Structures are given as C-alpha cells and as structure tokens.
Design a protein around this ligand. Structure first.
Ligand SMILES: N=C(N)c1ccc2cc(C(=O)Nc3ccccc3)ccc2c1
Length: 246
C-alpha cells in the first residue's frame, strides 16, 4: 500500500496473509486474501498460477505483522486450491483473476471466528456501489514502487471507485479494462495498492453493509497518474464462487 496508514488485524479481521514455502524451508510472503466463510479464503489466481502446488502455501488469519505471531492468529494449510479455469494475463490486464483456497488447520478445522478473525460479506448481483464511493484496501504490499522489502506492519488506505467509462479513457486503460473489472484510485494519485497487495480485499460499505466488492488484481505501476488500481468485480463471479464452494 502506497500512502495510507498503518493498521492492525482487529480493524481488518477478514484479511488473510498468504505465504509460500520454498525448497530448503524459507517462507516468503505472496499475496493477501479475504475470509468469505470459515473454510474459504478468496484471492487472485495470478498469485498462484506459476506455483500451483497447494502444499506450498501457508495462510494466516488474525495476523497483524509480516514477521510476528500475533496474539490470537490462526495458521492454515490449503486443502483445495481452486484457480479460475479461464484465468489469463495480457501485458497489463489479468482476466478471471480470482481464486479460492479451502483452508484447514493441522487438526483439520476451519477458522474459528473471533474479535480478530471474521468473514466479509459477498456482494449481491447487479448491485455494486456507484462511482465516487470510498472503499478501503488492505495489505502487506510495497510502500513505494522502488522498494524490494514489504512493510512489517499491515497497512490500509481508502480509494474511490472510478466508472467503467472513465477507466476506459485513452490515458487510463482504454479497452484493456473490461466490465468484469472495477477501477479505484486516489483523485490526487498519492495512495494505492501495489505489488504484494494482490489478492487482498477492496471493501465497500454499501447500504450499511461492509462488502467484498473487489479483489486487488492489476495496475500500471503504483499510485501513477491516470493509472487506477484494477480489481476483480466480485459480483460477476457469484455463480462461480457458489459452485466452487458447494
Ligand atoms: N496500481 C495498483 N493498484 C497495482 C495492483 C496490483 C499490482 C500487481 C503487481 C504484480 O506484481 N502482479 C503480478 C505478480 C506476479 C505475477 C503476475 C502478476 C504489480 C503492480 C500492481 C499495482
């Protein structure tokens, strides 16, 4: 997250921290995710497509720091890694950038909801917030594009949704951004998601309900002028999510 504020997991209790185990035992951070039901975390297929072995992943819920075992956190392995069969990547745009991770503790249990571990509601069909609505993003991604390290403390920021017609303007993304994607950015271009925030949530309060409107997917650079963050439009994928979690 470029700009924004440092936060803790009690403020974003649906946030999942996803890591990967390498040959030799080193563990590195991969992407964010969101808890949609006790056994299911939703994220972005581009985070996993090049390393599709479910055994390599570690998922934490209730974790506030990249290298601390936060009090109350829960650690999980991935029982089922579901990648979207029509996922694809263009030079900038990622398509069907959505994935499901069925999670299990070493005892075979799903998440236990608590003050610091909670689900986030899915959106309803054909009912996303209007352009100009403020939504929040959360993640352990880069603080500056030139950084190679990720921040130790979880961050959040607030951005505004941008219409499809504005996002398809020539100086924005043209025809590369589709109706299955949602743009969101800072009008002053000082805060955004960045590399390492992929898979994480874009949460919008809609009609008084906190909702997982989007999933961090792609963007040209980070916090660049006329280059919004692009998010998978979760409401489009409700049939896919329902069918793949049944
Ligand atoms: N400007 C943004 N909001 C934004 C969002 C997501 C991003 C993802 C990556 C990224 O590294 N994606 C990726 C990583 C590995 C394989 C495929 C895509 C880089 C910059 C981003 C900026």
């Amino acid at each position: 997250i470029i700009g924004g504020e440092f936060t803790t997991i009690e403020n974003q209790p649906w946030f999942a921290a996803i890591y990967r185990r390498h040959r030799g035992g080193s563990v590195t951070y991969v992407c964010g995710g969101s808890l949609i039901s006790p056994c299911w975390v939703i994220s972005a297929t581009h985070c996993f497509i090049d390393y599709p072995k479910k055994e390599d992943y570690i998922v934490y819920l209730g974790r506030s720091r990249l290298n601390s075992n936060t009090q109350g956190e829960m650690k999980f392995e991935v029982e089922n890694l579901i990648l979207h069969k029509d996922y694809s990547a263009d030079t900038l745009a990622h398509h069907n950038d959505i994935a499901l991770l069925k999670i299990r503790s070493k005892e075979g249990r799903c998440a236990q909801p608590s003050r610091t571990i909670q689900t986030i509601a899915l959106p309803s069909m054909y009912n996303d917030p209007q352009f100009g609505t403020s939504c929040e993003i959360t993640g352990f991604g880069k603080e500056q594009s030139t950084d190679y390290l990720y921040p130790e403390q979880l961050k959040m920021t607030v951005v505004k949704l941008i219409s499809h017609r504005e996002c398809q303007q020539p100086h924005y993304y043209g025809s590369e951004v589709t109706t299955k994607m949602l743009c969101a950015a800072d009008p002053q271009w000082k805060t955004d998601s960045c590399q390492g925030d992929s898979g994480g949530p874009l949460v919008c309060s809609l009609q008084g309900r906190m909702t997982l409107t989007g999933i961090v997917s792609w963007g040209r650079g980070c916090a660049l002028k006329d280059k919004p963050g692009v998010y998978t439009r979760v409401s489009h994928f409700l049939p896919w999510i329902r069918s793949h979690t049944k």
